[PDB]
Structure formats: structure tokens, C-alpha cells
Amino acid sequence: GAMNSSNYAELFNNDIKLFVDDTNVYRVTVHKTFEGNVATKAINGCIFTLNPKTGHLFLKIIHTSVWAGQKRLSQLAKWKTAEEVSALVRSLPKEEQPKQIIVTRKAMLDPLEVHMLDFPNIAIRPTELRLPFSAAMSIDKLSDVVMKATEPQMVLFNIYDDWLDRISSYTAFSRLTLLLRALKTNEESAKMILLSDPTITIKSYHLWPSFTDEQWITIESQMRDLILTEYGRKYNV
Amino acid sequence: MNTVPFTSAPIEVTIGIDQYSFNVKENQPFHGIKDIPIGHVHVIHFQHADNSSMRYGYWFDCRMGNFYIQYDPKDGLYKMMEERDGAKFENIVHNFKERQMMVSYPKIDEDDTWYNLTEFVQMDKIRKIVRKDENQFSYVDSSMTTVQENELSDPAHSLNYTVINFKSREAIRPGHEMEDFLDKSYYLNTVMLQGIFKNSSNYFGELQFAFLNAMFFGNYGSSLQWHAMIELICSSATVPKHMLDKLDEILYYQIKTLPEQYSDILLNERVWNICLYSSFQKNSLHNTEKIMENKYPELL
Ligand SMILES: CSc1nc(N)nc(-c2csc(C)n2)n1
Known about the structure:
By secondary structure, chain A is α/β, with parallel strands linked by helices. Chain A is 35% helix and 18% strand. Chain A: It is found in: Nucleus.
């Protein structure tokens, strides 16, 4: 059933599971037309499918061509998401298929469940966590590959860089969601924090800067301060 | 007109015949029910004065034999049985009418209620859902579970109802996942009507059967079946106009006949708001929608 604070550590056991987030699958700008009416223009999106134990990210890029001539795109996006996740499971070898897929939004349960009827033994589950994976497009290299895509494309990443060489997946996941929670609440400040010091670079095969253990500690506290603050600035406290 | 005699009434009980009911006292001189309309299926049903738990009863068609009721003090219930000695049966019936120990099936001439509730209920078809071949009549009670309920525990006492499942490979064509799940016309028209029922009359036959078992016995799996079969039509954009029109009549009489106080348990808010307000058929069930709003506006 639902995932929440109490069954948090299940994410880090040795059962293959994926999170699916569909919040960036269907993206639009809203603009005025010559006649003064409003219109949307779609932009490339992506399905964020993440193994929280390994950090493997299966970033399925949704090119705007998939929407051409379709109606009710917001509804279609959910079914397109489910179609792509299904295709992804089927392409994995059996021993790599997940035993659970956790959708970050309840509206995905029915579409995925229906697409996954061939896999009765894979549990489709919701969550009560408020996970910040929508901020995934605030990671520069992920936004970059999405916005440049000219066709549907799947790109593989490790969203933890090499962190698992030195920390556990529980810790790695907590660092990731703190980083993403901050990037979601104040993208400019969050990004300033991450890149202020020019001597800490991002390796070509990585997504985040190459912080030492101690530098990560200072970074982590700074992102904490940022979040607590924006919470004040917002509720005036 | 047919007669269902009773050997005797040893225990206080409320007896139902179709939509009619009457109290009988312990060892009151009651010998059964006369003037029953030939040409329809009937149900005679029982609730003991001592144990309102377990409503139970028997579906039967008078054309398929001479049937009578006899209390069994070992099993503790009124059992239907067949008399094959037709001479013995007419003799018995005539004696009890002469002594006027029978209640008259009390049909008002204006009233088509039972016909409208049972228009397509075949009795041979009931036998293939309440499987008990050595008997020409079929026993149902409040507690019997359905075959699909035993999937999600005795199969002999089960209600083999047509299995409907909206999230199933049967319902969902590969490559049309979104399409078949939002518009179930293919599941209804090809899989169910063309593959299982043969025609809408048979769809209605089971649907009516499912409702009556929910109403007369508060059988929960039947109530679920009635709502499933409604939901499948209301979730289909493409339904023959004649089925829609007949569904509206059907549901109208069922809603009309329901006890006003049983509404909270026998009606699924979600399915009915869908049929009446959200679904493709929101505009197509005029009689059903009018009686629901005037009689159960609380549900919607
Ligand atoms: C009363 S139960 C009932 N009634 C009718 N008229 N048909 C059916 C039925 C189910 S499947 C099939 C071919 N006929 N079931």
C-alpha cells in the first residue's frame, strides 16, 4: 500500500523498486495570441524514473511531437507515462525488473496498473510523502538534455554521482531530496549555494559538484537554512 | 394461476412472494400461496421471526413442476421440494383451497411491477449461476458469496455470475490501454454482449437477477454485480440506443421498488453519480435520473 514516513527504510532494502514521477511529462508555456486569447505552447518534458537504492535514473525524454493532434493532454500524459514505464520494464531482464513501482501522484495508479496487467507480480503503490522530484528540471544537465532533444530519447544517469562510494543509500537519498526540496523552494538561492565556489567543479560524468565530506556538510546545512527561511518569508514567522 | 402449498408452518416467519410479504405465527394454520401468475419467474423467501439473520428463498417457475414448501426441523428452514405425483399434488392443493388455508398472490391488475423487474430472467440461466442440477428451483441466501468474491470459499454454494473486471486483460486490449479503460465500449459490445451474453436481453436477465438477490436477501456480492453491469454500460460511449432505453426502464423500476430505508446499503454513490452526471450516458437515463433525484437526492 501507500508509502509514508513509517515504511521509509523499505526504499533501501534489496527489493528492486522504482519511483515514477510524471510532473514534468507535459510542460507548457502560456502566452497571448494576436487576437488577445490565451494559448499554450508545449515544451519537451521527461519522465523521472528513479531507483532509490542505486541512484540509477531512467530519464525518458518526452518530445513535444508526441502531443501533436491529441486532445486532453494532461490526461494523456499520465497514460503516456504509464506506457513508457511499461516499455521500460519489458526491456529490462527479468532479474532487473522492479518488484514495486511507487508513483508520486495518485492519478498515475490506474494508468500504470492497466499498463502493467502483464506483470501481476509487480506492485503499483502510491505514497503519502511530498517528494520534490518536480525540481528535477532544476538540475542543469538534466534540463539541458531534455530541451535539446529532437526526438523521443532515453538517457541514463546516476543521480547520486559517486556518493555511494562514501555513504549509504539512505543518506544519499536524504541528500538528494534536501537538494531538490531547496531547488524547488528557491531555485536561485539553491543554485547560488551549490556553485558559489569556482574551485569545486562538476565532473563531466556527474550532475552535482565534487564536494568533500566536510564541504557537503556545509552545503547540507545551507540548504536547510534556505528551506526554513523560505518557510518564514512565506508564512512570515 | 399456480399454487405453492405448505405442509405446515411450525415456526414464526415472514414469508415473501415476489414483492409481497406477510407474517405467519408459530403453528398458525397456513397452507401456502394460491393464484400465482403463471408465465414469470418467482421467488418465495423467508425470514425467521427469531433470527432476522439469513434471509433465504427459492427461485422457481411454475411451468417446470409442482413445487411445495415443507419445514425441516433438522436443518431448521423452509425447504422447497418437487412433487412428481401430479395427481397427489392437485388433490392436496384442492383440499387446502377448499378449506381456504391459502393466501392469494395479491396482484393489482394495474401493476406491472413484477413483470418490469423480471422481464428477461430465464429460469434455466438462473440454474447455471446457482448450480444445483438435481433441483428445478434455486436456493439463494444473504451469505452466499460470488465466484469472483472467492477469487479475491465453497464453490458449490456460490453465485457464478459473469466475471466483470475493468482492470483485466479481458477488458483491456494491448495497445489500447488508455482507450479501452476510459471508454469500455469494446469490453461491453464485443467481449461481453457478443462473446458471453449473445444479446442485450441476456445482459438484462443477469442484471435483473443480480438486483433482486441484493434486494430480497441483502446479498452483497449480487449488489456488487448489479453495480458492475450498470457501470460497464455507463462507462461505454457506444451503446445501442435500444439498450439504453431499456436500461432506463429497468433501473427505473428497480429504484422505484427499493425500500426507502435500504438506500444507504444497496446503492453505490460512485457508480450512480457516474451514470447520471459524469459518464457518456449522463444524458440518456431520463426516467432513472428523475426518480433518483426525487427519491434519493441525498445520495448524489
Ligand atoms: C437470470 S440470469 C440470466 N438471465 C439471462 N436471460 N441470460 C443470462 C445469461 C448469462 S450468460 C448468457 C448467455 N445468458 N443469465
